[PDB]
Amino acid sequence: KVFGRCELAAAMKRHGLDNYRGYSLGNWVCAAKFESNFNTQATNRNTDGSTDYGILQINSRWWCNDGRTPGSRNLCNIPCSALLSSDITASVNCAKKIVSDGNGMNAWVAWRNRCKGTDVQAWIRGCR
Ligand SMILES: [Cl-]
Ligand SMILES: [Cl-]
Ligand SMILES: [Pt+2]
Ligand SMILES: [Pt+2]
Ligand SMILES: [Pt+2]
Ligand SMILES: [Pt+2]
Ligand SMILES: [Pt+2]
Ligand SMILES: [Pt+2]
């Protein structure tokens, strides 16, 4: 699925991301835009043996198990294929675990580089 920004905002809000650990909803929508272009099926297969999965481009070394990545920790306790679902719940729950495991949103390079310090509310502006 490729989400619209307002539809993704509403789905993320239903799952408690607005103000999760002090990150407003627009931050999460912005991260998804620049990680995956709102595409639940996105993958980026890296040269280091790992792969980034789904709408939030969660990596298979620390966070999910794809079976094929050296150094697997599987800290979200999920197969990486669960992060390619059309519904966002597994990606949201794993994103919350990423923050809960010592990280800010700085764990996402696209967030740091394209959302941090910007008008993130533009991504929810005008949404019902
Ligand atoms: Cl829900
Ligand atoms: Cl729901
Ligand atoms: Pt789809
Ligand atoms: Pt949902
Ligand atoms: Pt939901
Ligand atoms: Pt939820
Ligand atoms: Pt949830
Ligand atoms: Pt749900």
Residue numbers in the entry: 1 to 128
Copied sentences from the primary study:
A re-refinement of 4mwk, namely, the X-ray triclinic crystal structure at 100 K of cisplatin binding to histidine in a protein in a multi-temperature structural dynamics study, has been made. This is so as to correct clashes in the protein structure solute molecules model for which our attention was drawn by the valuable critique of this PDB deposition by Shabalin et al. (2015) and that we have responded about. It includes the refined platinum atoms at the His15 ND and NE sites assigned as before according to their anomalous difference electron density peaks, which Shabalin et al. (2015) concur with. The respective platinum atoms' refined occupancies and ADPs are as in 4mwk, which were derived from SHELX least squares model refinements, as described in our article. But, as we stated in our paper, the His 15 imidazole ring we do agree is taking up multiple positions indicative of the structural dynamics of binding of the cisplatin, as we point out in our article. In 4mwk, we had imported the PDB's “CPT” ligand and then deleted ligand atoms that did not fit the electron density. We realise that this was due to the PDB's CPT having an incorrect, tetrahedral, rather than square planar, geometry. In preparing this revision of 4mwk, we have now removed the CPT labels on the atoms that we had and instead assigned individual atoms and which is hopefully clearer in our PDB files. The revised-4mwk-cycle-27 PDB validation server report led to our deleting the top three listed poor RSR and LDF moieties, namely, “ACT N 1,” “NO3 I 4,” and “PT L.” The fourth peak DMS H 1 has a good density; we therefore retain this moiety. The fifth peak, CL J, makes a sensible ligand distance to PT C at 2.30 Å away; so we retain this ligand atom.
